[PDB]
Design a protein around this ligand. Sequence first.
Ligand code: SAM
Length: 181
Amino acid sequence: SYRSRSAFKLLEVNERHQILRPGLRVLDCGAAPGAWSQVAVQKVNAAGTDPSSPVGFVLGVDLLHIFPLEGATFLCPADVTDPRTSQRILEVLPGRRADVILSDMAPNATGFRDLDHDRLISLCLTLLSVTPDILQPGGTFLCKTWAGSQSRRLQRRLTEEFQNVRIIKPEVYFLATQYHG
Ligand SMILES: C[S@@+](CC[C@H](N)C(=O)[O-])C[C@H]1O[C@@H](n2cnc3c(N)ncnc32)[C@H](O)[C@@H]1O
């Protein structure tokens, strides 16, 4: 059971791409209500439920309150784009780095379609710009984005900074792996 149907999208992405595994430290951006965080805790063994496997770590961040989850730490309210938020992230992550950065952040909808899409792409870019401080070299970045003209900039930057960038469909996700960075 999950706090949101979003879980199922992350479960499917991980099934194919194998981005979550025991021991990995995960940062989950736009984590409320916490379904991606629930998946992440299970797959990286953050609650230690499996004694036979490394114990990962999960930190979720959102503007909105997140109810406690066994095996995750949450920072809320916290704006992922606020410089204070990165420092708080660095203070909490084991070894001051994450192995996987997940992002399901989206602006609140306005009914202006280009504007909402562009704002989404902008969030992804701001997060990528703070990734050098947070993301383990070799690590993974998965973000919700929109697929079009304004997205090409984000896709180019990911291509420069990761060995491999996949576009994943049925909303669009970029999955960038093997951070140089
Ligand atoms: C679709 S929900 C995420 C659902 C989550 N992945 C889950 O599985 O429960 C999008 C979230 O992005 C958050 N968000 C939007 N902009 C943000 C920002 N600048 N910093 C932190 N969170 C943000 C929103 O508050 C909202 O909760």
